[model samples]
Target: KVQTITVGTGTQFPNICFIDEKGDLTGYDVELIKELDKRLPHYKFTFKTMEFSNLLVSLGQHKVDIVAHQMEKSKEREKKFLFNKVAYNHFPLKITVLQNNDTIRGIEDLKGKRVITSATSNGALVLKKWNEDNGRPFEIAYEGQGANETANQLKSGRADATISTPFAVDFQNKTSTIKEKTVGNVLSNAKVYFMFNKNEQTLSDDIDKALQEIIDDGTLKRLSLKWLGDDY
Candidate 1:
């Protein structure tokens, strides 16, 4: 009577979704998925790690039953995917700049600067969509090499800034990707959740209910502090 759930996630995002030194997926997103699997005994969750750029396409094409990366709920994505109402994390989309950047003090300062980002990330979507409504404030140069590459660019001044979360910055610093990565003004304070296929609405509801139970029992907060260094 147990159903197998195919969970997909990207391994590029540090702290959000990454392979730890122990050579296992040990991040906030992966931990949450594991906890969900533990709580929802009726469902067996299996993970499929793929390129960050391919995670959504695979999810849309039925290659994965659910996506466990730090995907934020978006109006545009909701039309094509079913996202659970349970928000696992609430974080600000932060602008990452080198500690020496004297001109770039805030998000508004990014208007004329080049910012690195993942093409499929929530912060990128928010930036692009907002740019669509207003005149293009700045140009987004995608980081082909993911999180560390953005840090690399900031280190060499190849890129002026990038978008990431607070925990990501901490991960980069811990891993020595960059010694001076600093957070700029908050971009979008958004809630992130797992993504499901549009046809899996019922399954999404089941997970949503289970997540609320975990939250009520304070398991979510414990995991948040354990992995993210602070309660989400």
Candidate 2:
């Protein structure tokens, strides 16, 4: 049987997918998926791009074969999907602020302040839990559905601070509009894996074998370096 993977486009522009002068579906994730297809010859693949948060829901409904978007593996997600361990790990969140802003240094400084974060993001969950546990009573200002929007909120001064990963912050900094500064250390460092439907255990097993072969052959490392600038 052939399997078609539904990968998400996530960000609208300059990040996930955009129409260039030549017009192409080329992006970091797209390239990585293509590389994976090249390595795995037993299956046929297709792409379905959507918002980042919706990808999981789609997977739950069997709308996609695999989620190739950069998603961090978490304990909460493990209950929902079978994660195929591919990349070693990446940081969960990095607090970013304007270059001149120095008032907010850590989570404690966020007390009584409005912090903007993405909906369904680990950062948002962490902040929500902190408020509930500590009773600090900070306000959550949800802006967009993805990290890109969180960066935009900080850039527009709509919020005091927001959280993003180092890779995401670095990508945002490349643009002239945003000046991102890391305010604190990593919130959580966990592996990034390909999430598959839990019911599809056999499919998950096959992918894991393919994943191991790719890792052992250095294809995974080479792809990581090409896109992420580091081999994990």
Candidate 3:
């Protein structure tokens, strides 16, 4: 009855993967998966690190058992996958501009400007809605298919501004060469959850139970503090 859980690495948080000097996964998620295996008693856990977007696709394809890639739950996604709600709903979307650009403060300032955003991402969808609602005609530069690359575009001055999640912007501020400043508050507050194949109801139920147990025992809180600097 041992189950091998394939968790993903290299999502938004670099520290979440717990990479070592030689580059290996060894973070809270790593330890938590091991703990889950022990708590379940009949299941064994394993990990397969991959990109966040790919992890979702893999979950649908049944290529992985569960994804611990810090995915946020949404009604749209819930229609396709079952979620183990671990972290409560909290969105951290913020407008990011170059440190030197003090004129732009909010979404209105983006008029006629080139803003970088990820293709097929919630951020992009949010920006699109903003533009449609406000009747603004801003250009979106999608150089790559990820938010990290959008940050790169802003750093290189390819775009005047971009939308970044709080955690992502924080990580960039700590690690990237380009200086970034937040222009406004968060856009969406959504819960982060572990998603599994919808058909795997039994597995999903077990994951939900394990998630509650971890939270009750303070393991999840400790992990959140270690990586996010807070436990919400």
Candidate 4:
């Protein structure tokens, strides 16, 4: 007998999680989940795509058994959910700006400027806290959709910059005319993990064991390079 696992993810963010050109729901997280299923023969993984903001809420309501959207840990989330013991990806947050724009070099330069971010994303959380602590140096334009519109904002000069990862910026540069670069030092070196309900300790531990195997075999690195364009 096999238990069905409902994996929640978003279809908007490219590379990390999104629908490909063939309308197939596939990306780093999606492929990684498939690998986990291959190892854990007792569990069948089924995907459920929705907005990033609803992932946690859906998990809390037992609508999904797991969330694999390159989720980073936060104090607020850790108290309610169970993250696997092993982290599968390293997600370092940095200041991203137009490649040709040289005026704003770092976070301090963004004072009174607009920085666009996705709602409920780690970048948003980190920058929001920085704003509250540093006297709100910049404005965070939160969007619910995807990075497509976020990139547009930067190109059109409606936004000053954004906090994102190298892989994301690389994907944008390759697939579109919007060239951006990561500047300054890393704001947060976040570890990405699979999210689960607090009571699903057994399931969490089982997946962690499988995840460890995937890491040991170099499959994780291969998938990262294939989808994210880097061995993150």
Q: What lDDT does each candidate get? A: 0.80, 0.67, 0.70, 0.87
Residue pairs of candidate 4 with colliding backbone atoms? none
Candidate 4 local lDDT, 1-232, one digit each (tens): 9999999999987887888889898888999999999999999999898988799999999899899988878799999998989999888789999888898878888888999987767789888988899899889998776547888888999998999988888878988998999898888887889999877888999999998899889988888888765526
Q: Name the candidate that leads on lDDT.
A: 4
TM-score of each: 0.80, 0.73, 0.78, 0.85
After superposing candidate 3, which stretches have Cα over 4 Å from the reference? Answer: 8-13, 18-22, 26-35, 51-53, 74-79, 85-91, 145-152
Clashing pairs in 2: none
Candidate 2 runs further than 4 Å off = 1-22, 26-28, 53-57, 72-81, 85-91, 134-138, 144-158, 229-232
TM-score winner between candidates 1 and 4:
4
Clashing pairs in 1: none
lDDT of 3 by residue, 38-105 (tens): 67876666777776658888888988877775577777788988886456224567777887888788
Model 4: lDDT of residue 17: 82
Residue 1 C-alpha lDDT in model 2: 58
Ranking by lDDT: 4, 1, 3, 2
Cα lDDT for residue 142, model 1? 82
Candidates 1 and 4 compared by lDDT, better number: 4
Full-model lDDT, candidate 2: 0.67
